[PDB]
């Protein structure tokens with residue numbers, strides 16, 4: 694009676710309201726910070742002439758994928774998690790996921806090149822000379838590949854006619870989605886991250902009668918090595934949920950029992966927010982583990 698009302702008030706109104714608020718709150722925070730974050734990350738590079746290494750041009754490219762995700766995809770990501778209907782029509786059903794898929798590729802690819810350029814620069818020197826000119830050439834290819842291989846993704850997207858629309862992959866047969874999503878979890882999460890991890894372990898064992906300038910070089914390479922591993926670990930953790938969730942859905946046909954549909958909606962919703970949290974996370978990573986970015990942020994915060 695008197696206390697059963699108080700409980701029944703909670704799940705039909707109090708919980709649904711407190712849940713929806715937290716959803717829009719975390720999304721607006723990530724949207725703003727990730728937007729303000731990566732924007733300042735570019736100005737620290739366009740302004741501070743000393744901070745233009747091969748790694749920073751790649752990290753600037755990492756912001757470019759994050760913004761495409763945040764500005765275009767992220768607003769679309771919020772409305773679907775709230776209503777779970779597609780409201781941007783047949784065509785944005787293909788564009789938004791494609792940009793989002795392309796931004797993942799450009800991201801995970803850029804991180805591998807920063808690992809690869811550093812693995813040669815620190816572990817196998819003057820094998821390849823990596824100048825900013827070759828660093829920028831690499832950055833253009835990432836988009837050429839990301840824009841291509843996410844194309845088959847765009848083809849599978851179809852907006853479902855069945856009084857509200859839904860956007861989802863249209864697979865002609867059971868086996869293709871298993872192979873497609875098995876291949877791309879390997880290609881764009883596990884294979885890059887596992888390789889990049891083995892790369893950075895080789896760097897840690899190295900860095901952790903040489904000239905005073907050389908140890909000055911080691912002191913800078915550790916501050917960058919320390920910072921970059923944080924960026925990769927943050928990336929794997931952020932993308933671990935949605936990446937595993939997608940394989941369970943598409944390869945193992947999981948999340949098809951309707952009993953805890955809220956728990957499944959909830960599960961995926963946090964997984965989607967974690968992706969954009971990585972975009973807002975990275976600029977914060979630079980401010981703490983990079984003393985030159987940190988001064989660029991304080992200098993930018995005072996003028997604006």
Ligand SMILES: CCCCCCCC/C=C\CCCCCCCC(=O)O[C@H](COC(=O)CCCCCCCCCCCCCCC)COP(=O)(O)OC[C@@H](O)CO
Nearest residue numbers: 838841842844845846848849868869870872873876877880
């Ligand atoms: C070291 C890292 C490794 C990678 C390194 C980079 C390698 C880069 C390679 C190539 C770049 C070019 C790729 C571009 C391929 C684009 C292919 C594509 O869009 O396929 C569509 C159909 O796909 C579809 O529905 C089907 C798409 C899904 C796949 C179907 C089969 C399942 C298995 C698939 C195989 C496993 C793939 C996994 C990759 C990770 C085409 O039809 P569409 O709509 O135009 O209508 C017909 C009409 O328009 C044709 O004129």
Ligand SMILES: CCCCCCCC/C=C\CCCCCCCC(=O)O[C@H](COC(=O)CCCCCCCCCCCCCCC)COP(=O)(O)OC[C@@H](O)CO
Nearest residue numbers: 805806808809812880881883884885887888889891892895
């Ligand atoms: C995908 C592969 C699978 C990933 C997931 C892996 C899952 C697990 C399976 C096997 C891994 C273990 C095998 C090795 C076991 C032996 C120990 C180990 O960790 O391997 C290190 C070597 O590899 C290493 O540094 C690794 C080399 C790092 C290379 C970094 C590449 C940059 C990343 C960009 C890639 C883009 C690709 C595109 C994909 C779309 C050893 O060093 P260490 O000093 O003891 O001896 C140096 C000595 O070899 C000198 O003669």
Ligand SMILES: Cc1cc(NC(=O)Nc2ccc(N(C)C)cc2)c2cc(F)cc(F)c2n1
Nearest residue numbers: 770773797877878881882935936939965968
């Ligand atoms: C409906 C739907 C789906 C998504 N799928 C994903 O992100 N898949 C995804 C991401 C990475 C990988 N790897 C293999 C690394 C595989 C699959 C969404 C992602 C978002 F960020 C936001 C949304 F609103 C989403 N909505």
Ligand SMILES: Cc1cc(NC(=O)Nc2ccc(N(C)C)cc2)c2cc(F)cc(F)c2n1
Nearest residue numbers: 766767769770773790793794860861877881
């Ligand atoms: C339906 C759908 C999908 C999305 N994304 C994705 O499928 N990504 C994605 C998918 C596959 C891969 N592989 C590497 C295989 C990578 C990324 C969406 C993203 C959004 F931001 C908003 C939406 F409404 C979305 N809807």
Ligand SMILES: CCCCCCCCS[C@@H]1O[C@H](CO)[C@@H](O)[C@H](O)[C@H]1O
Nearest residue numbers: 704705706708709712713716775955
């Ligand atoms: C953005 C927020 C979106 C909605 C999230 C709802 C999560 C579960 S609360 C929901 O409240 C309803 C009120 O009637 C009840 O019928 C259901 O049994 C109960 O599960």
Ligand SMILES: CCCCCCCCS[C@@H]1O[C@H](CO)[C@@H](O)[C@H](O)[C@H]1O
Nearest residue numbers: 826827828829830831832833834837
């Ligand atoms: C026509 C199809 C699109 C191709 C455009 C990009 C061509 C490659 S530039 C090349 O990229 C490498 C990536 O590893 C770097 O290592 C090099 O320094 C850089 O010179």
Ligand SMILES: CCCCCCCCS[C@@H]1O[C@H](CO)[C@@H](O)[C@H](O)[C@H]1O
Nearest residue numbers: 848849850862863864865866869870
């Ligand atoms: C005139 C020819 C027009 C062809 C239009 C193709 C549109 C996408 S076909 C694509 O084919 C895959 C088979 O590989 C299936 O798995 C996918 O579900 C399906 O979307």
Ligand SMILES: CCCCCCCCS[C@@H]1O[C@H](CO)[C@@H](O)[C@H](O)[C@H]1O
Nearest residue numbers: 867868870871872873874875876944
């Ligand atoms: C006939 C369909 C229903 C039975 C179960 C099929 C399971 C397919 S798993 C799929 O097998 C491919 C084989 O090549 C690999 O390429 C992929 O990596 C892997 O994920």
Ligand SMILES: CCCCCCCCS[C@@H]1O[C@H](CO)[C@@H](O)[C@H](O)[C@H]1O
Nearest residue numbers: 867868871872941943944945946947
């Ligand atoms: C504790 C178990 C939780 C669920 C995991 C089993 C999913 C059964 S479907 C089946 O699963 C195979 C692997 O088991 C895949 O190889 C096939 O492609 C897929 O069709």
